[PDB]
Symmetry: C3
Subunit: 259 residues, 3 copies
């Protein structure tokens, strides 16, 4: 495949022969890019970038740029780890990590819309969608199949659970629980993300069991600590409900207030 | 006029001889650009772009980029239709349509501020202002002389009426009625856009007749369905009030809740 | 130091010999850039730019672009004034002023994060932080050490006091008082910015004296006009409290509503 004449690629960058690089794009040293990845014009791939297979980088996307962190030492060799089949739209912005053993990690099949931003040391699983203009602070963690709507800001050190929805313009300051929808400023858990669960093809029995868990947690007139104890003492739970309980117990900032 | 040496323009692109194209801009095939249009550096004009007279494209503006739509077939020849005397500011982002007979349409004398975004299949009339960082989802419709403030997000399939105002950071999930101001998250109709009507030079009689319509609709202790019936049964209405009634009746998502 | 072969720099631009300019960056005439400033690729520096020492301009940053002001005459020679040790992150956007004697002014040691925007005729002191995606309208004034969080919009003609915090996604329509935190849509003064005061190393006595002032202003069941009179009649005040009183008295739009 074809690399454009005007593209500036460091001799040490390692690119599979199938990789395409468009006009006026800049690829630095200490970069690896695997099979079938396409890079369009004015794209910047910074030192430390490890890029998987069949990714796309649309015009002006910047990958592995310096952390927006005043205390970060810019002489450090830090990394951005990107999996397979990811789409980075125009002027999307991905920051590298802040320590050697602490990269920014993106899994597979994620979609980063135009102008979207991933801060230093974020960790992101698979099949997530970052909508236009949305910003993740440093150290934000996404699971799999999370949907972040347009112009959302997510506070540092928050966790976004599997199959969750964050609505347009929501200000997220605490965790987004799995299978749930969060909305507003101040943001609240509005309810279940039934749209995400149905599209995923969760059985009605699994959907009802997730419903039951959150009924106990949020709709039974009892504290969250008592609620989680109640669910464990109820019997053999499905993996999804086990996951809800763990997500609540392991929370660093706490879970977003329910509406 | 003058096209910059380093600009990459497909031989099949049709540009009036007066068209200026700045440094490192990229113009693809299947593009037409009419008289007096100026394109500055690092601008991208994609296949399908039909561009009228005396437009300006500021640095890094991207026109007719692929829809941010997971199901869209990227082999399809879809279009972006732009009228005359439009201003696209820096890194503004306009997406092409999703079907052959369904283009993204922009009329005349519109202003798209830096970082503003127009999603796939939007339809936009004349003299509208899209302020810095504002995002329209796919299938958003603007009339004429609408003002969208900074960092607003407009939900897909909403209609924004003539001479309306959307305030900074408003989250719009339903229609913005004509001559009105919408604000907040959740957003509400706050009242009339008297500033927009006065600048437009609506007579005091027309302004009062628009006032009366919305008095009946929103300030008379009656449902919106009853209100619209009341207005029709009142006598020969002015065009503007006829338009208000039609806008309410034809709404797909409904009209934003009143404050 | 080194200017990249493909960089387009007007012969009349005045650059200290230490200035570095990266690939495909564009520097116009009527520009001055002092010692130790580094410009990376795809950066645009427009006519009127006065740039101090040891600044950094990250990829795609645009400096001194035309005001987003419909009435502004584009034939006018207006200016952007930038001090020392400022960091402009990727695709950050700074607009020049609207009159000869009215430049956009940036002091020293400020941080403009990716996609951040400074509107025409803004005035900014020292050590301020403009977080990712945040937008200042035209004629916004920042003091020193103000922190504007991600995706904030600040209304034109507002003043942001020293050592203040504006939270993520806040819609600012009135002044942000010094030493205070503002949050929400609609935004309110939530309380003191103790984090900013402690990091600054304000003595406990100064912090308590700032606390006392705002106790009188906001927490004593009296109007703001009566409150300011009370504070003046109390005795010899510290500079910081004198500043609070002046900031309230000289306000053009008024000070943001307290929570
Ligand atoms: C509401 C969160 C908005 C997220 C903005 C994402 C912009 C992308 C910036 C990243 O590329 C680098 C950073 O990560 S720069 C840190 C940005 N974070 C803030 O601007 C929030 C206030 N910043 C703060 O320092 C913490 O938010 C506070 C400690 C002030 C909140 O207090 P708290 O943790 O007790 O929560 C109630
Ligand atoms: C509040 C709207 C925020 C608008 C964000 C504009 C970003 C630009 C994206 C476009 O370049 C491509 C799309 O058009 S991608 C669809 C983006 N829209 C959303 O992120 C809203 C939630 N997304 C949804 O799927 C619908 O908003 C819901 C069906 C979830 C809401 O339910 P609902 O229709 O019953 O309304 C109460
Ligand atoms: C809530 C403020 C949001 C700030 C958006 C910043 C985007 C950057 C645009 C600048 O690069 C050029 C301008 O400065 S373009 C003016 C942008 N300002 C607005 O969109 C606010 C509504 N615009 C207005 O005209 C005034 O906000 C109103 C007079 C309508 C409010 O009325 P008001 O002053 O009585 O306040 C209650």
């Amino acid at each position: 495949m074809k690399i454009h004449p005007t593209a500036i690629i460091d001799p040490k960058a390692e690119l599979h022969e199938s990789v395409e690089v468009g006009p006026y794009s800049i690829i630095e040293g200490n970069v690896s890019i695997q099979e079938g990845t396409i890079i369009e014009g004015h794209v910047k791939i910074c030192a430390g970038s490890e890029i998987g297979k069949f990714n796309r980088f649309h015009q002006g996307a910047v990958i592995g740029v310096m952390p927006q962190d005043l205390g970060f030492n810019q002489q450090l060799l830090t990394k951005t780890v990107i999996g397979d089949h990811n789409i980075f739209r125009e002027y999307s912005n991905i920051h590298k990590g802040t320590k050697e053993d602490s990269p920014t990690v993106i899994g597979n099949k994620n979609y980063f819309m135009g102008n979207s931003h991933v801060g230093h040391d974020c960790i992101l699983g698979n099949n997530n969608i970052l909508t236009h203009g949305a910003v993740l602070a440093g150290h934000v963690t996404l699971g799999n199949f999370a949907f972040i709507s347009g112009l959302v800001a997510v506070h540092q050190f928050c966790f976004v659970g599997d199959y969750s929805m964050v609505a347009g313009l929501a200000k997220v300051v605490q965790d987004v629980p799995p299978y749930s929808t969060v909305d507003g400023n101040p943001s609240t858990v509005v309810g279940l993300n039934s749209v995400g669960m149905k599209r995923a093809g969760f059985s009605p029995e699994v959907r009802n069991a997730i419903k039951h868990a959150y009924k106990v947690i949020y709709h039974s007139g009892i504290s969250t600590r008592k609620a989680l104890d109640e669910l464990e003492a109820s019997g053999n739970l499905i993996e999804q409900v086990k996951y809800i309980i763990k997500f609540f117990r392991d929370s660093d900032r706490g879970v977003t207030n329910h509406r």
